[PDB]
């Protein structure tokens, strides 16, 4: 999920701006529910995740808001020491304790269409549910959420954010939210604010928080930090905040999940776009979203490194000279501006092959044995920090490759990508253009349970929010534009007829068009 808030001083119009982009996948019916709420003293338009009695992406009369997943450290695993003589006992605070055993009965629709009962047994300890049990090593793993039992207080916090009329009230609501999100605020007086909300445990200083905590009683949480210690800022001096699930602040840690907060981080696309402009407007924010949605994210750090290496050798290799020219000219995107079904820059197909080759040469030998767990780290969708450090010769804890080896990888990866393209496509970059990848709004969301029938309409894949709002907080009211694909209404009639509003926002979404953000009733009545 991405977000931006622009303060007065960075805004072309002098009005604070807000951009929303929650990434909750692409499903039909959609993951979002758009609504307008109007009662005396409360006027709000926007969307929330389906089922929520509150708006998350939009604006009330006083403020605009959005959120992105925090990736803060609110789940800990405890390593329970089991009794060798009884694997349902674990050692805790000086004595063997009995696990709580539970059996649940599931009514199941059989393949014959009739009911069938299945029972399953699970265990809990003082720390939480047991998620993994290994009797032969006398260990079990249990799970603790810092927010256990406070989910309804988090709902109330979000409703209070909806009812808030100023930053004091919004911050009060933020302080009550117990799960890990980033919240963003913009008001009609030019102010912006950012909060990394959540209830964060005070952990033992004797443990490494990237690994499970011993469950024997010496290393329990010692309470929760005060909200004032949560990362937050009102009107940061640079005049904006951008986020794409990246780190809130320099010394904020997240334990086992640090793999998302490295030197190479996809939020760079948003930083670059804001830093390259002087004052910005909503049209600029949309251009930045477009860039981020189509960028080959490895370009930011890896394209300069590739170009530098090829330039070193280009006087003896005209293929390297050609690639340098083509890489420098390329705008780093995999886009299809002429709607021909092929990505426009042929060198992007080269760069993709080069990257795949390079990642494999860096890590196949050393990490093949753990690839099922490490490929998602070293080729992570948010960045490839370790690969960058190894290839650039920056400090690492382990010497994965020498400097000579790193250079050789960059070159061999180039040669192999060239050879493949020459054999399968041709000599010139225009011949290398790859067919676009497409996506559909399917039946099954991140909750991993089908919730409808989906859609088969194919659209170009985009690394983009499931909805977007672009909001300018003018002195009189919020204004702007948005899209909430696939459409408002998930109803399909028993005869197969889709609602007229089932997928009537898909073309807008695919074609970078929007509908007006409606706030004044006179406008709503004409919409």
């Amino acid at each position: 999920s991405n977000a931006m808030i622009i303060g007065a001083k960075k805004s072309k119009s002098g009005n604070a701006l807000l951009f929303s982009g929650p990434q909750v996948g692409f499903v039909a019916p959609g993951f979002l529910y758009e609504v307008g709420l109007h009662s005396p003293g409360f006027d709000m338009e926007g969307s929330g995740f389906i089922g929520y009695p509150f708006i998350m992406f939009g604006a009330n009369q006083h403020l605009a808001l959005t959120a992105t997943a925090g990736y803060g450290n609110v789940t800990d695993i405890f390593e329970e020491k089991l009794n060798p003589a009884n694997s349902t006992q674990y050692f805790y605070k000086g004595k063997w304790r009995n696990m709580e055993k539970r059996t649940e009965t599931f009514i199941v629709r059989g393949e014959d269409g009739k009911s069938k009962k299945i029972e399953e047994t699970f265990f809990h300890t003082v720390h939480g549910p047991v998620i993994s049990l290994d009797k032969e090593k006398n260990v079990a793993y249990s799970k603790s959420w810092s927010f256990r039992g406070t989910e309804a207080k988090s709902i109330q916090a979000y409703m209070k954010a909806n009812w808030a009329k100023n930053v004091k009230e919004f911050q009060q609501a933020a302080s009550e939210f117990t799960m890990s999100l980033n919240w963003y605020y913009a008001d009609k007086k030019g102010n912006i604010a950012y909060y990394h909300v959540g209830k964060y445990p005070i952990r033992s200083n004797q443990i490494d928080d990237r690994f499970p905590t011993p469950g024997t009683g010496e290393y329990e949480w010692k309470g929760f930090q005060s909200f004032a210690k949560n990362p937050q800022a009102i009107n940061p001096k640079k005049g904006y905040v951008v986020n794409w699930n990246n780190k809130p602040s320099k010394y904020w840690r997240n334990g086992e999940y640090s793999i998302v907060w490295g030197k190479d981080n996809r939020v760079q696309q948003f930083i670059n776009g804001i830093e390259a402009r002087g004052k910005v407007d909503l049209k600029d924010l949309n251009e930045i979203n477009y860039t981020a949605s189509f960028a080959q994210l490895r370009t930011h750090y890896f394209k300069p490194l590739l170009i530098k290496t090829l330039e070193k050798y280009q006087s003896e290799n005209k293929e390297y000279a050609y690639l340098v020219e083509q890489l420098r000219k390329w705008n780093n995107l995999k886009e299809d501006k002429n709607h021909d079904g092929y990505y426009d820059a042929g060198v992007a197909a080269f760069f993709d092959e080069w990257w795949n080759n390079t990642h494999d040469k860096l890590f196949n030998d050393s990490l093949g044995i753990v690839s099922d767990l490490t490929r998602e780290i070293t080729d992570h969708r948010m960045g490839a920090t370790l690969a960058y450090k190894v290839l650039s010769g920056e400090p690492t804890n382990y010497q994965w490759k020498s400097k000579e080896e790193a250079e050789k990888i960059i070159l061999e990866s180039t040669d192999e990508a060239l050879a493949k393209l020459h054999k399968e496509k041709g000599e010139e970059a225009d011949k290398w253009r790859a067919p676009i990848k497409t996506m559909t709004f399917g039946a099954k969301s991140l909750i991993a349970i089908p919730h409808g029938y989906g859609s088969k309409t194919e659209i170009i894949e985009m690394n983009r929010g499931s909805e977007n709002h672009y909001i300018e907080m003018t002195p009189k009211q919020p204004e702007g534009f948005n899209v909430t694909p696939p459409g408002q209404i998930g109803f399909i009639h028993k005869d197969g007829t889709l609602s007229e509003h089932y997928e009537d926002q898909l073309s807008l979404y695919a074609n970078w068009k929007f509908k007006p953000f409606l706030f004044d009733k006179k406008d709503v009545k004409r919409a």
Binding site: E34, V35, P40, T385, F491, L518
Partner: protein
């Protein structure tokens, strides 16, 4: 179009988005649940079943493992009621109103199922049940908990153990520190050090 539904005026725009004009929050939140049910009843039903671990009742044995995980990690109705009872009374009442609005659509649709119950309920041969405020909390939990819940500590333990077996502890520790670092000081941050001053560190 513009219609009155009980005491609330609902304007649906050209995209079908409902704009609710109510005289107070109690009426507003009932209408909010009602329009969401009009638009998304089967989706709501299945999201709730996800949190309850009752998906397999509809979609069969291939969802039992998912349902097991949900009951294992979830809360009973009474535990959720205890959560609701700890809210401000007005907030609890508005969540109750939202559930009443979903229920009002359920009741209407069960009375006219051929026109008001979507195809999935016909294909799978069941009716939606009425909703309580605890079920609204379940709709929140089924999605919001996903962004918070992970077992990466256990994956990390497995990475380290396998690296130790392959390369020895000394080398495995260094490799692990490069895979999952304690704090990458160069990682881009939403708040920059120069965006504000922490007085206590002295400027």
């Amino acid at each position: 179009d513009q219609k009155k539904v009980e005491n609330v005026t609902i304007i649906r725009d050209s995209y079908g988005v409902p704009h609710l004009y109510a005289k107070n929050k109690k009426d507003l939140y009932k209408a909010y649940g009602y329009v969401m049910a009009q638009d998304r009843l089967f989706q709501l039903e299945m999201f709730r079943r996800g949190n309850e671990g009752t998906v397999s009742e509809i979609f069969g044995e291939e969802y039992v493992t998912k349902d097991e995980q949900s009951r294992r990690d979830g809360y009973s109705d009474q535990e959720i009621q205890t959560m609701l009872n700890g809210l401000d009374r007005e907030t609890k009442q508005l969540i109750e109103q939202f559930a009443e609005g979903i229920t009002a659509y359920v009741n209407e649709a069960v009375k006219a199922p051929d026109q008001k119950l979507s195809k999935e309920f016909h294909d799978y041969g069941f009716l939606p049940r009425k909703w309580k405020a605890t079920d609204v909390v379940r709709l929140y939990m089924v999605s919001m908990t996903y962004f918070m819940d992970n077992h990466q500590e256990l994956k990390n333990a497995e990475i380290l153990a396998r690296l130790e077996r392959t390369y020895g502890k000394e080398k495995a520790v260094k490799m692990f520190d490069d895979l999952v670092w304690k704090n990458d000081l160069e990682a881009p941050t939403s708040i920059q050090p120069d965006d504000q001053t922490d007085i206590k560190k002295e400027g």
